[PDB]
Amino acid sequence: SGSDFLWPAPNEEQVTCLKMYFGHSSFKPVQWKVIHSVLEERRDNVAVMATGYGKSLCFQYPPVYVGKIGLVISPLISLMEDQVLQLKMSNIPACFLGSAQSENVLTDIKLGKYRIVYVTPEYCSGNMGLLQQLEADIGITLIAVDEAHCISEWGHDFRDSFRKLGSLKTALPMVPIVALTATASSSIREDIVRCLNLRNPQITCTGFDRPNLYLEVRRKTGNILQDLQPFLVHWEFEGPTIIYCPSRKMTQQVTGELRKLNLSCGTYHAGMSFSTRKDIHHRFVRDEIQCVIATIGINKADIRQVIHYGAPKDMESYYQEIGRAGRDGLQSSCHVLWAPADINLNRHLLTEIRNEKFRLYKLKMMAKMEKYLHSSRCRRQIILSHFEDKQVQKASLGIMGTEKCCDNCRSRLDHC
Ligand SMILES: Cc1ccc(CC(=O)N2CC[C@H](NC(=O)CCn3c(=O)[nH]c4ccccc43)[C@H](C(=O)N[C@H](CC3CCCCC3)C(=O)N(C)C)C2)c(F)c1
Ligand SMILES: [Zn+2]
């Protein structure tokens, strides 16, 4: 599935380059997001990959595709040497530039015969003029900064050699920087953005299996209150709850039905003003309202229940929307209530799209969402297979296959 579930769609030359130089058949969603932002928007990136794997493609692919140069700053010397070896095994010219390197290799770099150049932060801070000449003559596709959290003095593994990296954006303001890390700390990420002088960067955070989230899919009965009664205990939810609806009309229907039971809840849609949405968010965090019925950023630490009333839009929005739950690490649940006649499964609503690539993309996303909803397989396995590479999937242990994972694992443990 090279360009199946990705928008903008990777063109056929890009898929060819991927298959031929990296041996992969498709881009993972976050990989394509980073690569496309770098290639088309020249935009800085802060990329958190929780498990640590799956970040090599993000900074190796763009300079190979465009045929220019890519700089990789890292302190992990043995890893950089192994990656140089692996790249040269794939007919990708790459080298680990340092102080003890021949001027033959240096002029080869200046002539643009190396696709990827690995350097230490010390050497990088010691030779900014070389980097500027490389940008002027060849053109630097991106500058990757691995272990970027080391630039934060507030973190555990601060390295002084990262400090001077603050000058990069000063000397090459048009060259995008891709700062990669494995920590999800918001303050660490703010420090990375600040010290690297990044300009409105795209921030991605992926690589989780979220063991504290239980997944389940149920069919609608047609009656809103009958559908939502199992989530209630005068009447109230078991905890702070978000209900995602596909439209504002269904949002209002659900809100009125819940308020028939004197439930403390509030609506959250784009048709309201900024102040009203901020007030609803503040009252949700303060627990004055127990439930938010929304059509989509709701940031709250102790969300115990997410309910999609209706089939979600696609796997990406569903991913982002159930990710809001259980941020405190405590047990939470994510239920989808769906029916084949739901709006987000209506292909007739796509017949008017003019861009044929976009029409195919919408059809593919709709079909994949329906196949997830109808599947008897492990929901978490489906999500991780769609979003993460195999190495990230295998790093997940302790949740998949247990009765706290999803409804299908639970049914396969119970009598069949
Ligand atoms: C089994 C399973 C179920 C669900 C998920 C998804 C998931 O757990 N998250 C939680 C972590 C992260 N969200 C956030 O950073 C927002 C804030 N935030 C939150 O709401 N909870 C958080 C917890 C920790 C840190 C920040 C949090 C995930 C997410 O959408 N990233 C996207 C990247 C993008 C998503 C589409 C495909 C391409 C790439 C992102 O970075 N954007 C800026 C959009 C979703 C999963 F990973 C595994
Ligand atoms: Zn499962």
The first and second tokens of residue 127, run together, are 């030779």
What type of residue is 377?
Answer: R
CATH number of 213-413: 3.40.50.300
Q: Is the dihedral of CA 339, 342, 344, 345 positive or negative?
A: positive
Give every CB contact of residue 52 below 8 A, 6+ residues apart in sequence.
182, 207
How buried is residue 212: exposed, middle or buried, by Cβ count under 10 Å (0-12/13-18/19+)?
middle
Give every CB contact of residue 2 below 8 A, 6+ residues apart in sequence.
10, 15, 18, 19, 25, 26, 27
Q: How far apart are CA 316 and CA 330, in angstroms?
A: 23
Q: What is the DSSP letter of 40?
A: I
Is the previous residue joined to 8 through a cis bond, with omega within 30 degrees of 0? yes
Q: How far apart are CA 55 and CA 188, in angstroms?
A: 18
Give every CB contact of residue 223 below 8 A, 6+ residues apart in sequence.
none
Closest to 162 (Cα-Cα) out of 77, 75, 99: 75
Fold match flag (12-206 vs 213-413): yes
* Sequence ranges of the domains in the chain: 12-206, 213-413
Cα angle for residues 375, 376, 378 (degrees, 5° grid): 95
29 lines ligand 1 (CB under 6 A): yes
Q: How far apart are CA 18 and CA 390, in angstroms?
A: 17
* Nearest ligand to the C-alpha atom of residue 217: 2
184 lines ligand 1 (CB under 6 A): yes
Give the DSSP H or E segment for 105: helix 103-110
- Give 227-231's long-range contacts (Cβ < 8 A, gap of 24+): 227/309, 227/337, 228/254, 228/257, 228/258, 228/307, 228/309, 231/305, 231/307, 231/335
Domain spanning 12-206: which superfamily?
P-loop containing nucleotide triphosphate hydrolases (3.40.50.300)
The residue whose CA has the least distance to atom 19 of ligand 1 is 324
Q: How far apart are CA 5 and CA 371, in angstroms?
A: 14
The first and second tokens of residue 313, run together, are 């839009």
321 lines ligand 1 (CB under 6 A): no
378 a known binding residue?
yes
DSSP secondary structure string, 262-313?
A: T--EEEE-TTS-HHHHHHHHHHHHTTSSSEEEE------S---EEEEES--S
State the distance from the centre of ligand 1 to the C-alpha of 206, rounded, in angstroms.
6
Give every CB contact of residue 129 below 8 A, 6+ residues apart in sequence.
none
Experimental method: X-ray
406 a known binding residue?
yes
In sequence order, what E strands does 79-139 have? Answer: 94-96, 116-119
* Nearest ligand to the C-alpha atom of residue 316: 1
24 a known binding residue?
yes
Q: Could you tell me the CA-to-CA distances from 137 to 14, 69, 73 in Å, in that order?
A: 24, 11, 20
Q: Are 243 and 309 in contact (CB under 8 A)?
A: yes
What type of residue is 271?
Answer: G
Q: Are 43 and 88 in contact (CB under 8 A)?
A: no
